Amino acid sequence: VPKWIQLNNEIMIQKDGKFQFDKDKEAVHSYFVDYINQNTVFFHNLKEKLDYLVENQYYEEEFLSLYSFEDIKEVFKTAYAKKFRFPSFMSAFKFYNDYALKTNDKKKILERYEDRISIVALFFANGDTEKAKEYVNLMINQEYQPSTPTFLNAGRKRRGELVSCFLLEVNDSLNDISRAIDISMQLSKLGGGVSLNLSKLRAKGEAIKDVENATKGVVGVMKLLDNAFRYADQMGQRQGSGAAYLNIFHRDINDFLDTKKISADEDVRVKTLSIGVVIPDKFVELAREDKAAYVFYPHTIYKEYGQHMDEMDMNEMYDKFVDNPRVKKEKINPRKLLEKLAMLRSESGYPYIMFQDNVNKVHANNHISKVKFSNLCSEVLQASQVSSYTDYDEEDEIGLDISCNLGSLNILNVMEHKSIEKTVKLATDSLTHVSETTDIRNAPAVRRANKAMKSIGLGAMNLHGYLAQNGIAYESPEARDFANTFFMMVNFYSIQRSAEIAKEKGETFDQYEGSTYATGEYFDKYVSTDFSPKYEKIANLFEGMHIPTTEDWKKLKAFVAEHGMYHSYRLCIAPTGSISYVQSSTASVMPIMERIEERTYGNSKTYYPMPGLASNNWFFYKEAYDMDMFKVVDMIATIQQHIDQGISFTLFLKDTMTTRDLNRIDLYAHHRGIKTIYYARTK
């Protein structure tokens, strides 16, 4: 075994009844000295390194040409002036195995952490030396973390897309379905995950040009999408991941769920296609009263009313559909469907549960469209318009398709530096640059919506790490108070930066005037309620930082009304997975699954304690499965009220908790305003 791995295994070797947590720093030192410093290509100067990387098609030349070499050298000096040291071996291992640039033969390492960060900052700044140095300070302090696509591929020629997600609306036509397959493959080859809304597709047994019982339902389209994502497997290095979302009132909802059953035959089962279920409040009401529900055939509704099933408010039109003889449906049991959802999530973790009315109750851009579906990570909730892809040599009607411009704030490092405002504004600027520089030619709706909506996703991570390292239990009301204050601050400064960008560019996002930002309805709870901490301990955490008040929110509302808002969406909390190791952070705002992660790499067993774990804060780092899921729902809903998009909310379930417990958690999440539920992780 290697020396660093052997030293890492001494974490679990307990002496005097305590874990040898100090051995981890020795593991980082051994790892670097024995592997990294030996297998990193070193050049006589930064000029030779840059020439080698651009000439050998490792870096793009366009973004480096915006700076003189003096500016680039100063930026790299700023990155290395911090003298950043990885505090855990797993952080360095993750970076130098996944995100560090390597030679074409993968034998050596071309990029350090201070090199990848410098290149990403130079990409973000776009010719500005001071902005590049600010980004370098932001990332080397680990206050803000660009998403895995953005961090990996910024300024590199051998890349994919910096966009993490692609949310595609699939219209009810063979041409539209074929274009959905094409766009799904063209966006999977770019690396980003693709989510598709299949609620517009007509159900099984529907008519294709007045011949009845002709359709095979959305399950055939899921088969096509699953094989399309399998084909676009990105070399197999990361398997093609795709999501499919269906409204729970869609007739195919039972067959949609039947594909995730283990007992399901290979003739119906889909493997690479994750599934999500969109649940309007009407379904929850029907389940609550234990009255028979109806799943409708979408094409009958489209023929009768001229509008798609998912474009109509089901809370208002459910009765109209039911008493309509020209609308086809079959009676179902909403409580039986809820139990089926609970057991499917217990067995496989699917489907993602999207509470449509919870999303659209506080959705700012309902005028553009209501949020009909979420992304593969079940955290992006944006307005989308379907695209009517017509026959060849006929002009297509291009709609709006959602894309992830993701970035995560490290709550621990953000609040240690007392720079919530600066970090949020710089992250918003970086995400704006990523959205602007994204130009996807094979996805027309994605490109059009990226140009028009200018939506970005600014998430946060290391919530549990910050709370445990500050002596706050995740389920404690003080933790919820801190999350309320912190995410209200994040929302305030994200809105402020969006309005500042709109003022400086003279343009807002498309159809901004109809949004609640323009009408001032979005800021109602912010100008009516004070989100300052209610606990003295929590208020001390924000000391040295100006917490926005009701009057400050009124000034921000006036500023937005006068100048507009550049981004339709700004905040969405992604799961923050493999990049959380590099930032030495807990994943997302979720609680930690295990105090010490047991990971297998090759023939070695590697251990990763969560950052800041020690004897004093051992019980503050409570495992997620040990937590009360209701209090985690409370925490997320406290965070959710300050996030305009959704949060990737994973349910951590014990083996002893039945499907009724999972359904209770789901219904409490719906009752508390949770927008989406990502996963049901059973231990």
């Binding site: 234990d290 139990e339 039945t658």
Partner: peptide, 12 residues
Amino acid sequence: TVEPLKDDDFYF
């Protein structure tokens, strides 16, 4: 298990 829902799981 596969414990069914009752009327009291829909109010909190």
